[PDB]
Write a protein that binds this ligand. Structure first.
Ligand SMILES: Cc1cccc([C@H]2CC[C@@H](N3CCN(c4cncc(Br)c4)CC3)CC2)c1
Ligand SMILES: Cc1cccc([C@H]2CC[C@@H](N3CCN(c4cncc(Br)c4)CC3)CC2)c1
Ligand SMILES: Cc1cccc([C@H]2CC[C@@H](N3CCN(c4cncc(Br)c4)CC3)CC2)c1
Ligand SMILES: [Ca+2]
Ligand SMILES: [Ca+2]
Lengths: 611, 611
């Protein structure tokens, strides 16, 4: 109902044209009608539209210079008045002729002293998918987006300012990144830098960030303008020597690596969501850098990190399988055919030196659980329960399990001091979520790990869209079996003797695991064989065999998507590694300056062949 | 850290340019600065670079003839001095102007008596992937690689030598094979043979091998230059008579078949590893030859070899299934429910004439085991244990099993004289590795054998990349089951009563083989049904059904790779067959000479249609 208020007013805007004789004569070139419209009497001028127009705005909007020339002769005061109502707020007639890419009227409006620095800050211009467009907030910002180059120089010549910024802090050089006509706007970016006369006081007009705090180079990395990124690299690199077909160049490397602050360049590529921008990882100075940093020093620190965790789980699961049990004392099997149990484990009996060996491993796993908590969820000293909602989707899928690995190991610290009955249940999740987590180390380790990016893409969606429709069908038949054996003895075919297990066992026949019941000794009810054969056609010949073919398109449709997603997680491992690991170890890559006459910013180089 | 020492020096090279006034004036055309740089005072010249340059080298490198002309006027002695430091070792300024493909300076350097035969033998030129290039070691070798043809004649005219060789023994005709711009260098190869005036004493400049011992024809077969191979065939063939559309030509056949020595041509194609060169098997004179030699005399010797081995295993397995057992004597089942056994086989009781029939077959299989050893691993008289490491990867995958087939048959020779207890275990591998080996004879035998090249490509990788992630998941749940039935009676659901079998049985449920446990008579523990249903979703509906679709791309992505790999193993069977089989049988193919006026080298012919 939000966008309804736009077009409700927008037809209503046209009503005032049909309502007024001035505005309807303004939409057409009614210069004969406009001649007598203000000469025969002193009719008023400032009658606004439904959303606050002048006829000068309308003559601008419906591309009519001629009546606007008569409107200049009638009343040359309308130019100062902008529009006023909440969508087109502050926009004046200088903007619209620029949007119309010429009207030979910037020759006329500026001659009538067109105010340039007005800020059309209405919400029909803010960067949002509710608008279909984005153009900035200044007339110099507009004409660049439509590239009317001759108009731009005349717009500059009467005192345009390059350094204008918006509420978002962006200047005109941020805007040319955001246009969707990529290469047609690239030569526009070269033109404005030619009109950079000087640095104002500190930076030479390209080094300025926004209110988000990003230079326009880094913003191109955010949106992933692949063509524009290659054009803005050309002043960063520095060719060194050429040898026939040999080319030896020195890339810059000061904007594209972690220098302290959280906004280098590479954190931004992982933390964004746009799939288009992840293809920045195949341009020249970055792909060589990340492959160098992963190979030298990057890979073996990850694996030797992984070797510790593998011994952690072994020291957990051996401490799991040894456990202070006891024979079943003081409690018979007095519930007959209900308790088939023998242990009811001990309470405080560690009086054995072999238990000290277990007392090692229990102490081993509990301290590392605190380490896992205080390295990835540090925001626990605040003690915020609603903070956990900002930790679920903020973080990867493997950034969820290992957190939940900790809580279960916290419970076996909690429970064994309290010594209550329920003990194997938190230990159960503690044991199976542990071993499943080792695929987090199967990210790299060889090229045998873009298998794991495939099973990630399949478990979300393409089995969850099957897990519903299994429960669609199977909740029918299981109750249908539950009725159809309701009159039956349990001691033969105890599959469906009660609904909580009868719901389970029909799920055991959907995946063909259990054999499918038959006695063949006494005669089963004569409606079973009908409805059960109905079950096997739908389940294990239609439904499940569809699913293998269902993967059949979602395995080559995403063929070269898994490989580009495999280059995602290595950078996501590399940047995560450098930020966690300190100095005097992991020497920061590239080659330093100050020794060779270059400067303080570091460098790397790549030698190749033109061919 | 190895290539770091390159670029550490390489920026440091540029520092001496920034450090010295001569070298910085040398990089630019500072002829006014160079005019006073040595006229105002007698400044020294031999100030080398960080890696040993002159300004003449730099003027050559940064394409500046003009200062080099002034450098000739200042001091015409720098040409004799080469570079000196370990990477560009021995390279002089004559090389670099050649790499720059002209400078109008070979007109000047040779006028100043440019030394031609210098050998730039630094390790920035040795054939290695550490270098990005390869160009040989002589100025005549360089200009051919960049094809500056006019320069080459002027380079020859002042006394270039064609017959130069390197440390690798290669001459300039080996070099043109190795360039990656294939057809652009082909006409270069025709030019140098035109400047073959005479044979030196013995060979006419094309018959010379390298230090590896290969003529440049055979080297083209090694690297697989498919276009260049077709150009070097044109002097080997000999057209005979044409009949309208009929064409009758006589190919050469003396360089491409086993003539004694181990380096004919066809051993080289199998023993190399480059996938590009195996596509030499579809040019004209080879594909017809190998198909002729496989069809006539080749195929039936392989199958009649295979028929012997099939009767060998039958005579093994019948000797396997008859075995000197005995009833269980002197040893009761005193470990109760631990020994369910009845035999504890005999020791030295062969007193039966039916055993002589078995004494045939035991003697049959043991002698052939020595035959298998002394035909494929002859290096056992040396008695080298570490030699076995040079026999594993050196040899095919079927060149491993049949070796390990021998050791197990050696153990049943060893064990039955010693008569210890463990007897069925080496016999077990002896029986199953035997029958699996018969796929080695399913290489050819019909076209129903590029199935076996497919299962080879799948068992390495595409199931081994699944065999890890099975053990990832299943080591969790099996311990998780082991906990969750730790308090449970074993006599009902004895699946998980101890961990070494509980590890096995959960592996029995991952491949859906066993039924999946249920009693349905007494009530199982109330956390089992939760975690077990969690198991079947992950295992037998997500993991295993992914794998069928995982083959789904790796069965048509390698579609016309298996057929080209099927032509590999037939040549690998043919060449293996000829080398093992003697003369006075397997008449060596082609048609002999000396009877028709041709000569001593043999020949074959192919008749076809131009169409
Ligand atoms: C994205 C991605 C990528 C790769 C792998 C994963 C894992 C996703 C969740 C993980 N669970 C293991 C055990 N679970 C469970 C344990 N007890 C009870 C219940 Br009910 C469920 C459910 C699944 C398996 C693989 C995820
Ligand atoms: C390249 C290629 C191409 C085609 C065929 C093969 C064979 C590869 C190995 C061979 N083994 C047979 C028995 N094995 C075994 C025997 N006892 C215990 C264990 Br554990 C393992 C493992 C596999 C099967 C086919 C290989
Ligand atoms: C049962 C099962 C199991 C696993 C997989 C499959 C199918 C999956 C993929 C399918 N190709 C996909 C589209 N095609 C194609 C490929 N390149 C270019 C063009 Br044009 C078309 C040919 C067939 C073959 C088998 C089926
Ligand atoms: Ca089955
Ligand atoms: Ca079954």
């Amino acid at each position: 109902s939000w966008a309804q208020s736009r077009d409700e007013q927008n037809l209503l805007q046209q009503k005032r044209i049909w309502e007024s004789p001035l505005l309807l004569a303004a939409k057409d070139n009614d210069v004969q009608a406009l001649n007598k419209l203000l000469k025969y009497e002193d009719c008023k001028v400032h009658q606004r539209g439904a959303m606050g127009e002048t006829a000068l705005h309308i003559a601008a909007l419906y591309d009519n210079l001629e009546a606007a020339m008569v409107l200049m002769e009638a009343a040359p005061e309308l130019v100062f008045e902008p529009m006023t109502s909440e969508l087109y707020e502050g926009q004046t007639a200088l903007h619209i002729a620029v949007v119309n890419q010429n009207m030979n009227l910037v020759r006329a409006l500026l001659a009538r002293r067109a105010s340039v620095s007005a800020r059309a800050t209405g919400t029909a211009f803010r960067r949002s998918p509710c608008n279909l467009i984005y153009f900035g907030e200044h007339p110099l910002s507009f004409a660049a987006c439509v590239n009317s180059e001759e108009i731009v120089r005349l717009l500059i010549e009467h005192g345009a300012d390059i350094r204008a910024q918006d509420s978002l802090g962006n200047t005109v050089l941020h805007i040319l990144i955001l246009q969707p006509n990529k290469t047609f706007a690239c030569q526009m970016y070269n033109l404005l830098l030619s009109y950079d006369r000087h640095g104002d006081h500190l930076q030479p007009l390209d080094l300025v960030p926004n209110h988000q705090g990003l230079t326009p180079f880094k913003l191109a990395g955010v949106e992933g303008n692949t063509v524009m990124f290659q054009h803005l690299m050309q002043k960063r690199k520095h060719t060194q020597w050429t040898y026939g077909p040999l080319t030896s160049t020195l890339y810059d490397l000061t904007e594209i690596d972690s220098s302290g602050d959280e906004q280098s360049l590479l954190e931004l590529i992982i933390t964004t969501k746009k799939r288009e921008a992840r293809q920045i990882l195949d341009q020249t100075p970055v792909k060589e850098l990340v492959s160098l940093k992963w190979k030298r020093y990057g890979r073996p620190y990850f694996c030797m990190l992984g070797a510790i965790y593998l011994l952690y789980i072994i020291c957990f699961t051996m401490c799991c399988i040894y456990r202070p049990l006891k024979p079943r004392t003081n409690n018979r099997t007095s519930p007959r055919d209900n308790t088939l149990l023998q242990q009811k484990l001990l309470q405080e009996a560690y009086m054995t030196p072999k238990d000290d060996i277990r007392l090692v491993g229990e102490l081993v796993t509990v301290i590392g659980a605190i380490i896992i908590l205080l390295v990835e969820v540090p925001d626990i000293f605040r003690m915020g329960v609603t903070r956990f909602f900002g930790q679920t989707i903020l973080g990867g899928p493997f950034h969820v399990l290992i957190i939940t690995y900790a809580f279960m190991v916290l419970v076996t610290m909690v429970m064994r001091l309290i010594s209550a009955s329920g003990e194997v249940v938190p230990m159960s999740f503690a044991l199976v979520l542990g071993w499943c987590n080792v695929m987090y180390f199967a990210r790299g380790f060889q090229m045998l790990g873009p298998f794991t990016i495939m099973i990630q893409k399949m478990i979300f969606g393409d089995l969850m869209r099957f897990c519903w429709l299994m429960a669609v069908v199977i909740l029918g038949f299981a109750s249908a079996f539950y009725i159809i054996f309701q009159t039956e003895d349990p001691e033969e075919l105890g599959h469906f003797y009660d609904y909580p297990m009868a719901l389970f066992s029909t799920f055991e026949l959907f995946l063909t695991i259990i054999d499918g019941p038959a006695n063949y000794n006494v005669d089963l009810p004569f409606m079973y064989s009908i409805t059960y054969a109905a079950f096997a056609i739908i389940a294990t010949l239609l439904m499940l065999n569809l699913l293998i073919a269902m993967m059949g398109d979602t395995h080559w449709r995403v063929a070269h998507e898994r490989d580009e997603l495999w280059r995602a997680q290595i950078v996501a491992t590399t940047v995560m590694l450098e930020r966690k690991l300190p100095r005097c170890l992991w020497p920061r890559s590239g080659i330093c300056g100050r020794e060779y006459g270059l400067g303080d910013r570091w460098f790397l180089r790549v030698e190749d062949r033109q061919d």
